[PDB]
Enzyme design. Structure first.
Site, mmCIF file in Angstrom:
data_model
loop_
_atom_site.group_PDB
_atom_site.id
_atom_site.type_symbol
_atom_site.label_atom_id
_atom_site.label_comp_id
_atom_site.label_asym_id
_atom_site.label_seq_id
_atom_site.Cartn_x
_atom_site.Cartn_y
_atom_site.Cartn_z
ATOM 1 N N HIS A 20 0.802 -1.237 0.000
ATOM 2 C CA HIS A 20 0.000 0.000 0.000
ATOM 3 C C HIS A 20 0.836 1.289 0.000
ATOM 4 O O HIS A 20 1.631 1.520 0.912
ATOM 5 C CB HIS A 20 -0.949 0.004 1.208
ATOM 6 C CG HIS A 20 -2.090 0.964 1.078
ATOM 7 N ND1 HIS A 20 -3.301 0.610 0.525
ATOM 8 C CD2 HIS A 20 -2.205 2.265 1.434
ATOM 9 C CE1 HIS A 20 -4.112 1.653 0.544
ATOM 10 N NE2 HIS A 20 -3.471 2.669 1.091
ATOM 11 N N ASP A 22 0.135 5.595 -1.081
ATOM 12 C CA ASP A 22 -0.850 6.625 -1.465
ATOM 13 C C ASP A 22 -0.262 7.777 -2.301
ATOM 14 O O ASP A 22 -0.781 8.895 -2.268
ATOM 15 C CB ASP A 22 -1.540 7.188 -0.208
ATOM 16 C CG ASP A 22 -2.609 6.269 0.336
ATOM 17 O OD1 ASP A 22 -2.488 5.833 1.501
ATOM 18 O OD2 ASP A 22 -3.583 5.985 -0.394
ATOM 19 N N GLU A 131 -9.365 1.580 -1.824
ATOM 20 C CA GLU A 131 -9.388 1.559 -0.364
ATOM 21 C C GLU A 131 -10.770 1.923 0.183
ATOM 22 O O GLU A 131 -10.998 3.047 0.627
ATOM 23 C CB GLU A 131 -8.299 2.484 0.191
ATOM 24 C CG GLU A 131 -8.021 2.281 1.674
ATOM 25 C CD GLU A 131 -6.789 3.027 2.160
ATOM 26 O OE1 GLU A 131 -6.348 2.757 3.298
ATOM 27 O OE2 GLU A 131 -6.255 3.879 1.416
ATOM 28 N N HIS A 158 -12.809 1.837 4.504
ATOM 29 C CA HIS A 158 -11.763 2.746 4.981
ATOM 30 C C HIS A 158 -12.144 3.138 6.423
ATOM 31 O O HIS A 158 -12.275 2.246 7.260
ATOM 32 C CB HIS A 158 -11.563 3.932 4.025
ATOM 33 C CG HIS A 158 -10.374 4.779 4.369
ATOM 34 N ND1 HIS A 158 -10.477 6.111 4.706
ATOM 35 C CD2 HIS A 158 -9.060 4.467 4.465
ATOM 36 C CE1 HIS A 158 -9.276 6.587 4.980
ATOM 37 N NE2 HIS A 158 -8.398 5.611 4.840
ATOM 38 N N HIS A 200 -8.214 -1.798 7.741
ATOM 39 C CA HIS A 200 -9.281 -0.818 8.047
ATOM 40 C C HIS A 200 -10.645 -1.400 8.484
ATOM 41 O O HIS A 200 -11.501 -0.638 8.937
ATOM 42 C CB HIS A 200 -9.494 0.188 6.894
ATOM 43 C CG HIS A 200 -8.411 1.209 6.767
ATOM 44 N ND1 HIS A 200 -8.428 2.399 7.461
ATOM 45 C CD2 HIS A 200 -7.288 1.230 6.010
ATOM 46 C CE1 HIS A 200 -7.358 3.106 7.145
ATOM 47 N NE2 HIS A 200 -6.650 2.420 6.266
ATOM 48 N N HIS A 221 -2.091 -3.176 4.686
ATOM 49 C CA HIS A 221 -1.292 -2.399 5.638
ATOM 50 C C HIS A 221 -1.897 -2.457 7.047
ATOM 51 O O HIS A 221 -2.707 -1.612 7.436
ATOM 52 C CB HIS A 221 -1.076 -0.950 5.155
ATOM 53 C CG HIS A 221 -2.335 -0.198 4.849
ATOM 54 N ND1 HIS A 221 -3.254 -0.624 3.914
ATOM 55 C CD2 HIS A 221 -2.807 0.975 5.331
ATOM 56 C CE1 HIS A 221 -4.248 0.242 3.851
ATOM 57 N NE2 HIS A 221 -4.001 1.223 4.701
ATOM 58 N N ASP A 291 2.232 1.688 3.763
ATOM 59 C CA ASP A 291 1.315 2.830 3.842
ATOM 60 C C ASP A 291 2.083 4.162 3.701
ATOM 61 O O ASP A 291 1.706 5.173 4.300
ATOM 62 C CB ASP A 291 0.476 2.790 5.137
ATOM 63 C CG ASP A 291 -0.740 3.712 5.096
ATOM 64 O OD1 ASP A 291 -1.201 4.082 3.997
ATOM 65 O OD2 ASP A 291 -1.237 4.074 6.181
HETATM 66 MN MN LIG Z 1 -4.226 4.481 1.861
HETATM 67 MN MN LIG Z 2 -5.134 3.194 4.953
#
Ligand SMILES: [Mn+2]
Ligand SMILES: [Mn+2]
Ligand SMILES: [Cl-]
Ligand SMILES: [Cl-]
Ligand SMILES: [Cl-]
Ligand SMILES: [Cl-]
Ligand SMILES: [Cl-]
Ligand SMILES: [Cl-]
Ligand SMILES: [Mn+2]
Ligand SMILES: [Mn+2]
Lengths: 381, 381
Positions: A20, A22, A131, A158, A200, A221, A291
């Site tokens: 993961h 972003d 996500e 999430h 999550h 993650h 992450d």
């Molecule tokens: Mn993320």
């Molecule tokens: Mn996350």
């Protein structure tokens, strides 16, 4: 150093596949997805933990790039839900453009074979995950189209409850794990060949998903609850059910998930979490799930994507074998993706029925009667 | 009959590729996109002009299946626009499932090479087009993702004005042809390799698009204005500009577009329209664009998809040469698709900038300052 030389060799032999990152959302924040004439900045970013120079520097073999969009905040829930779907297509679009504009560094991958071919060519295998099921706007049709756009895992939630499952961080509970729609979606995710991601999601949602799924799942993650009690970390119960599931827990670099005081979090803590899982459920069920760019600051020694060789070296220093380090680096997540695709091919080969959306009637009985009358007239000819 | 034997030979030698069929919307109307256990009905439909048995019977070589959804009617324009996007993904989903569940009959195609390979294997080359820019919800990102989902033409409008262009049937005029956004979108459509479809657009929008486009365009289902004056038909001016553009007019079977009294429309009228265009702008710029399942009833002799051999025979009876009939059947639309892909490869090879969406700022100056401060701290390490 001998250990750093060993780490470099492993990173060339086997791809380190991170669960993961972003970086696509950082591009939305900084550039607003307009990367025309921004290569100088994309290689050396003024913000964040990821850029194309540091990505090369850390010798990362593959990456599941996150196509995350935030949970809908609009009072009109229909608008907010549909807005999230459009934003998802924007993030999938910028990910594909990022890959296509930098073909010497990044190469799109959606399978075990495509990961390896990318790695043989000296490129970062670029996979995609969304996500949260808020991103599909309650449309299983949309979800199948996201799979066709290259999405290979779906985080069930999430930081918001959706129609399918409960998130960890939100209370009170809505469904108490998975909903009835959620349970039915697990079958469809297995059928289409989409990896289930349980990061999550609530502890009860993990337990239910781990028992119901016919394919191995991942935590893209998440870290270990026993070492650091947090709603986002994986309990010993769910670690064991992950073992039975044949899944992989990809350990997170989030400082909040590694230590009670976030400023105390280190590279050593990440290694403790990997070794805990590897010792108790075997090193074939553990991965790396940074992450990066989902946080402002990382642990000491894991500040950005250039720091992966220190993690590989650190694992070898603690007495984890080469073969087990290669497993944690990427072989395990390749296996899960490979098994998810095999289960999908088996179920699709058997002719299993797909989950369809509940649609409104567009024709009344008068229109349907006109059509049947017309068809009969054609049969007379 | 010698002429019917000749028609059958041509249909096996060259694929007849129809420009527009709304069978996917009939599936949404009748089945609500749930085709599980409905093969008996999909092969022999109780409604409409298309099913899988009659599709084989007419010897059709290829089809652009329409992923049409209606123009948004919601008073809240943001909701209606976003609803159309979700409905588009539902229609693309059912098209892909229709193809995948019937692989002996249908094979997905998105290029000239994939059309031919499908035709060599004895399957109907199944391409996709969307009918109106209302379907993308003002998102160029979404449009590029639709291209990735297999959409190979975009009708600029249906029966509603959008932000990009004017429709033919609606008055008063909004933009008076194309808008400034529309003009800019023409460049992006050429760059990505999406065929421009000018059916349903206003006469002035056609004129402007035909002058601006760097690739050949199509009319997926339009007929000839000089033979039958209608807002949906193509004027002599635009026929000439189509010739310069190198495009193809795919002649429509809509009875309203062939005769003043709809009940008088026939197979002979369709042939008159094909010969008119072929005589005046050459048989290399004319095609077949039925619009089957976009109407209740078709012309006498063209009642459904089984009637294509009568059209091929009818053209040969009137004195159109074999080579010109083969052009009208499918070679011309293959050429346009091939040239659209060549222009896209040329422009993408030259590194032309893509059109990006106007996005909102997600970070304020405080968040951006935190990120730059954090990056500087990492540079110090
Ligand atoms: Mn993320
Ligand atoms: Mn996350
Ligand atoms: Cl291998
Ligand atoms: Cl952040
Ligand atoms: Cl609906
Ligand atoms: Cl050929
Ligand atoms: Cl109808
Ligand atoms: Cl936006
Ligand atoms: Mn249509
Ligand atoms: Mn139409």
């Amino acid at each position: 150093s001998p250990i750093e030389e060993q780490a470099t060799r492993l990173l060339k032999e086997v791809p380190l596949i991170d669960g993961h990152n972003d970086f696509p959302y950082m591009i939305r924040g900084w550039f607003r997805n307009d990367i025309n004439g921004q290569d100088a900045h994309l290689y050396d970013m003024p913000i964040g933990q990821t850029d194309l120079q540091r990505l090369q520097k850390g010798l990362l073999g593959g990456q599941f790039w996150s196509a995350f969009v935030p949970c809908p905040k609009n009072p009109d829930k229909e608008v907010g839900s549909l807005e999230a779907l459009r934003q998802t297509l924007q993030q999938l679009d910028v990910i594909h453009r990022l890959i296509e504009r930098h073909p010497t560094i990044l190469q799109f991958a959606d399978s075990a074979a495509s990961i390896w071919s990318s790695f043989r060519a000296g490129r970062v295998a670029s996979l995609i995950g969304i996500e949260g099921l808020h991103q599909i706007a309650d449309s299983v049709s949309a979800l199948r189209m996201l799979h066709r756009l290259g999405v290979r895992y779906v985080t069930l939630t999430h930081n918001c409850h959706n129609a399918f499952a409960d998130a960890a961080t939100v209370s009170p509970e809505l469904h108490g794990g998975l909903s009835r729609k959620g349970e039915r979606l697990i079958r469809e995710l297995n059928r289409m060949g989409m990896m289930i991601d349980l990061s999550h999601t609530s502890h009860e949602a993990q337990t239910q998903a781990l028992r119901l799924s016919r394919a191995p799942v991942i935590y893209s993650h998440s870290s270990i609850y026993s070492l650091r009690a947090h709603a986002r970390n994986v309990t010993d119960e769910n670690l064991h059910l992950l073992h039975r599931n044949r899944g992989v827990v990809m350990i997170c670099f989030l400082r909040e998930l590694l230590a009670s005081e976030a400023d105390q979090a280190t590279l050593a803590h990440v290694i403790d979490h990997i070794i805990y899982a590897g010792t108790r459920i075997g090193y074939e069920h553990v991965g790396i799930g940074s992450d990066f760019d989902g946080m402002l600051r990382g642990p000491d020694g894991l500040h950005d994507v250039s720091c992966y060789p220190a993690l590989v070296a650190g694992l070898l220093e603690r007495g984890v074998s080469e073969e087990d380090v290669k497993r944690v680096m990427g072989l395990n997540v390749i296996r899960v993706l490979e098994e998810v695709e095999r289960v999908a091919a088996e179920l699709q080969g058997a002719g299993e029925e797909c989950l369809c959306d509940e649609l409104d009637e567009v024709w009344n009985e008068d229109i349907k009667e006109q059509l049947t009358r017309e068809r009969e007239r054609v049969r007379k000819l």
